[PDB]
Structure formats: C-alpha cells, structure tokens
C-alpha cells in the first residue's frame, strides 16, 4: 500500500506568480513504472516521469488553470496510486450574448458560460436605475436553466413595456464572482 504526500490546496488570486503543485511518494513495496499529472480527469502533456517526487508548475495561473489535479503513480506489477490537489480560482465568464433583438410575443434566450473551479452558482439580474436587481417571475414568463458551467435565461411572450433592458448573469463561487450583461431590445 503506497503512500503519497501532497502540497496544500491552492487558491489562485492573480496571474503574476507561478504556483507549484507537489506530490511525494514516501513509501512503496513496488518499483515505479511511471508517474504523471492529470487535470480534471485528463492527463497533462509531458508529465510522465519516473520520479517519486513530482512537481507541476502553473505559469501565469488563471481561472482556466483551476480544477482538481491528480498525481498518478503507475507501478510495475501493482495497481496505480494517486493523490489529489485542488486548485481553486474565481469564475471567469467566457461566453455570452452582447445583445438580443426579438419581437413582441417571441421568446428571448440569453446565456453565459464560465470556466473556473469550484463550479459557480448562477444568478440573473436586471439593471434598473444603475443597480442590478433580482428578476421577478410574478408573470411566470421567466425560465432559468442552471448547470455547472452554464446558465440560460429564457423570457417567453416578450412584452415591450416590461422586458427590454440590461440583463446580467453573475457567477459566484467561494473564491469570487464574475458578471457580464446582455442588452435585450424588443420590437414590433
């Protein structure tokens, strides 16, 4: 039963300083065939080395670099072993609609996509009087689909009096928040 010690959980705050992840194989009854690093379940490029003490350097760390990292140890004649290091960052919203123009009675569809771990929670707001406030569904016309890295707001039966304006999506996790906005224009 092999033993692996790791460096501590990493919280990314900005992109200046590199961050280094470490795993040390501290006990083994089997010869090491090789060890590598994975990120979010996928092997990282050129990390396969035959070293008990592994390091992974993240240069210019960003939200894209966050996730669950594993140092994996493949043994000759024995099952693999791994340990986990979490690298956390504030969300980054990577996709949205800048604007949407629809007709009265049609449906509006707005969305946002994020990168960052832990996956964010999402909220939609509308800008009124310079302040982004919570969206009322008193009308029953607002539908929100929230996934881990994606949110979607649908507004059915568009009304030109009430619906136009600036809508923003806010992605929040324990590290921080990000938001972007979409302008909705209703016509006809």
- Residues near ligand NAG (CB under 6 A): 5-7, 22, 24, 53, 137, 140, 142-144
CA distance 96 to 137: 22
Report, in Å, the least distance between residue 49 CB and ligand NAG: 14
Q: Which residues contact 149 (CB under 8 A, 6 or more apart)?
A: 113, 114, 115, 119, 120
Length of the chain: 188
Whether residue 39 contacts residue 64, with contact meaning beta carbons closer than 8 Å, is answered with no
CB of 41 or CB of 140, closer to ligand NAG: 140
CA distance 126 to 60: 34
Report, in Å, the least distance between residue 13 CB and ligand NAG: 21
CB of 103 or CB of 146, closer to ligand NAG: 146
């Amino acid at each position: 039963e092999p033993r692996i010690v790791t460096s501590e959980e990493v919280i990314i705050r900005d992109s200046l300083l590199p961050v280094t992840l470490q795993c040390n194989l501290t006990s083994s009854s089997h010869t090491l065939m090789y060890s590598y690093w994975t990120k979010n379940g996928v092997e990282l490029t050129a990390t396969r080395k035959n070293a008990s003490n592994m390091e992974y350097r993240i240069n210019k760390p960003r939200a894209e670099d966050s996730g669950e990292y594993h140092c994996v140890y493949h043994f000759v004649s024995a099952p693999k072993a791994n340990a986990t290091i979490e690298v956390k960052a504030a969300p980054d919203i990577t996709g949205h609609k800048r604007s949407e123009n629809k007709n009265e009675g049609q449906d509006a569809m707005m969305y946002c996509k994020s990168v960052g771990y832990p996956h964010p929670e999402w909220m939609w707001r509308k800008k009124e009087n310079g302040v982004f406030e919570e969206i009322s569904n008193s009308s029953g016309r607002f539908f929100i689909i929230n996934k881990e890295n994606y949110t979607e707001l649908n507004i059915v039966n568009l009304q030109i009096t009430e619906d136009p304006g600036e809508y923003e999506c806010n992605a929040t996790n324990s590290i921080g928040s990000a938001s972007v906005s979409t302008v909705l224009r209703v016509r006809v």
